[PDB]
């Protein structure tokens, strides 16, 4: 949503991630992608680190003691220090001072330093007869230049699956969609890891990875977008945003309204309550449209009407014209328009008459065009045009 | 259909080889300084240079052995040179072509680079990133305007 503050697993001096008994299992996203299940223990030895590969003998690096309580001199850099300084020369020139916090002590009585070595003061046990105050992480080895002890500090805190659950309650419209709350912490890193001198105020982050699982997209609208947007009717009065993190299948329909002399009047109808899960079988949205003038709408097809052409009958469609002539024509004579066509009197009629015989004709309107062979057509039959559509061309 | 692209196109991949070899070069930076510096101090006492290899070093130096000091010390101030040929674009951009040509505003900048190495300064405390440029931009400019209007101009 939003990013939380969790001061625990902060600090203001560097590190050592030598932690205890937190656990992801390494799982790659011991990283962002952070797991944080289990660890009321973060055994950590904040520090100073200076990866500056530089010529040998700059100013002076001194092992065997901590430089100065406050900003100390080193080699043309200085130090918001916190203690003992692993001095760090290696290969013809030196590269990275690693100061690690605090506390020299003074190991004379030589037989000391590794005489107890990766065991610190567990606060509870103590080493050569010295009150055991806190976790004094034993310097791995210590005392070069002979006389000066170290077991450094440690720092530690308890962080469980989640040290502080937020809200933790969430159900959704869910006609099978399945949504979930989740406030995972986040983790500076894992014992693969050896920290250095950074903000160090970054060793935890209980933000929200809140997800939405389950397939069945049919009712589970945008699953691979089961993905948040959040709005504001919960701004004040229930001021808390409803934090749906809602998704959306806002199907878009044109007005489809134009009363076209062929598309016509298109009827709009809904069912919106504020939402039946697209009402399994819904009257969502409608577009009823109309057909031109009078019409035995006829041989007209199955809705989609890919062929907008629709056989259909108006007063004018059938040519309705005085057959004083004797009963001569019938259900579909082929009038190509000629002479003695309305016998005695003649007419212009055209196309395929469905009869000329009460004296009122039967032709649904028709009109011929001689052609040639040589042809390249488009229309075949049952094709009510609109204008200038292409028909049978002749190269 | 382009030599600028060429520069890319063969040095855009050129890296800086880090600044560690600075000291590896330092050894050579000198050493060359020497090898000449003697050999012309020796020009300069006499013979205006006997054109002799040994005199190429005040201290003794087996011909092939010292031939290894040079060439190696040279590739030192040559690879690093070719290496430090990326950020230069900065000077190009800042000085587009200065009424000349992008390229000529970088090849004249190359007159820098060399005029860095040499008086780049080892055991300094940071790269010529604040010193190499320096030359660079003081070597271009000087050019640029020396260069380009077909009337030289005095800088005053």
From Swiss-Prot, chain A:
Functional note: DNA-dependent RNA polymerase catalyzes the transcription of DNA into RNA using the four ribonucleoside triphosphates as substrates.
Family: Belongs to the RNA polymerase beta' chain family. RpoC2 subfamily.
Subunit comment: In cyanobacteria the RNAP catalytic core is composed of 2 alpha, 1 beta, 1 beta', 1 gamma and 1 omega subunit. When a sigma factor is associated with the core the holoenzyme is formed, which can initiate transcription.
Listed name of the protein: DNA-directed RNA polymerase subunit beta'
Gene field: rpoC2
Swiss-Prot record, chain B:
Summary of subunit composition and partner proteins: Interacts transiently with the RNA polymerase catalytic core.
UniProt motif (Interaction with polymerase core subunit RpoC) ranges: 104-107
First and last residues shown, out of full length: 79 to 234 of 390
Name of the protein in question: RNA polymerase sigma factor SigA
Function: Sigma factors are initiation factors that promote the attachment of RNA polymerase to specific initiation sites and are then released. This sigma factor is the primary sigma factor during exponential growth.
Source organism, top-level taxon: Bacteria
Organism: Nostoc sp. (strain PCC 7120 / SAG 25.82 / UTEX 2576)
Subcellular location: Cytoplasm
Renumbered residue ranges of the record's region Sigma-70 factor domain-2: 80-150
Family: Belongs to the sigma-70 factor family. RpoD/SigA subfamily.
